[PDB]
Design a binder for these strands. Structure first.
Ligand SMILES: [K+]
Ligand SMILES: [Mg+2]
Ligand SMILES: [Mg+2]
Length: 217
RNA sequence: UACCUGGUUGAUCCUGCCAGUAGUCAUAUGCUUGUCUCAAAGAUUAAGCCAUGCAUGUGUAAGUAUGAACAAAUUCAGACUGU
């Protein structure tokens, strides 16, 4: 079946780690997609966003390969992006799905004004940049919906954000850079220091230290 | 009610525009057009030129009646006193 090759994979298969937030807290790299499948696999959905052909010139013509862009998300604060290039479309799509699973990140959602109910928009103004494409997200009031193009709109929908205002500059017709800028903007949500985070951090044992004895075998 | 997509390349990321998409109590034209309620309409070019018809008249007890105007009365007198 699955034979983990990493300490994190062993812990996830042994049920020692039960939530993706435990891994996110210590910023540990995730190198096996079975970890994500076990943790949040049931609620994850995938979608192929674009199949892009690329060509390399050779002495005997053009060698064509296909680029697959895949977005995964649970619609509840987790989203991932995957890009893979392969000779066959199916292989590229499979690799892109694996990479999108491996890159899932937590998305912070906040309130525009009054803080009643679940969060509905981005906590603050965030901006992402890939290549020349820059994507800006602005908090929006409840009921405003997702005001974004179809690619950013899909990325935001997979992240579970209910309403947001967006603006884009640059070559947004470069779909890869557009989606990557949106992904970077979403990732930057948890890096902004707000007054609610001013409390002193109270550290907890890392999984590799907490379960060192188990991993010692 | 804070949104983009096609097009320069063997392929790439750009600048940049062309094209698309939507709107006008916005004009015109094409095809089509069964019912109800609303409703613009010779401004744009020529404040260019105009046949014909109409679009400014007017009376109360209370300015001026002798129509040779109509009506009712008067057998005798009457300035006039109805229209
Ligand atoms: K009019
Ligand atoms: Mg604008
Ligand atoms: Mg070509």
């Amino acid at each position: 079946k699955w034979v983990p090759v990493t300490k994190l994979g062993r812990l996830v298969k042994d049920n020692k780690i039960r939530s993706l937030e435990q891994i996110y807290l210590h910023s540990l790299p995730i190198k096996e997609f079975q970890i994500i499948d076990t943790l949040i696999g049931p609620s994850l959905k995938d979608e192929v966003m674009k199949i892009m052909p690329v060509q390399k010139q050779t002495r005997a013509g053009q060698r064509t390969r296909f680029k697959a862009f895949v977005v995964v998300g649970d619609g509840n604060g987790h989203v991932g992006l995957g890009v893979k290039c392969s000779k066959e479309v199916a292989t590229a799509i499979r690799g892109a799905i694996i990479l999108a699973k491996l890159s899932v990140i937590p998305v912070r959602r906040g309130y525009w004004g009054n803080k009643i109910g679940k969060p509905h928009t981005v906590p603050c103004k965030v901006t992402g940049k890939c290549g020349s494409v820059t994507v800006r997200m602005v908090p929006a009031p409840r009921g405003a919906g997702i005001v974004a193009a179809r690619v950013p709109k899909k990325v935001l929908q997979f992240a579970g954000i209910e309403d947001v205002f967006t603006s884009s500059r640059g070559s947004t017709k470069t779909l890869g850079n557009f989606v990557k800028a949106t992904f970077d903007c979403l990732m930057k949500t948890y890096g902004f220091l707000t007054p609610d985070f001013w409390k002193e951090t109270r550290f907890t044992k890392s999984p590799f230290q907490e379960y060192a004895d188990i991993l010692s075998k």
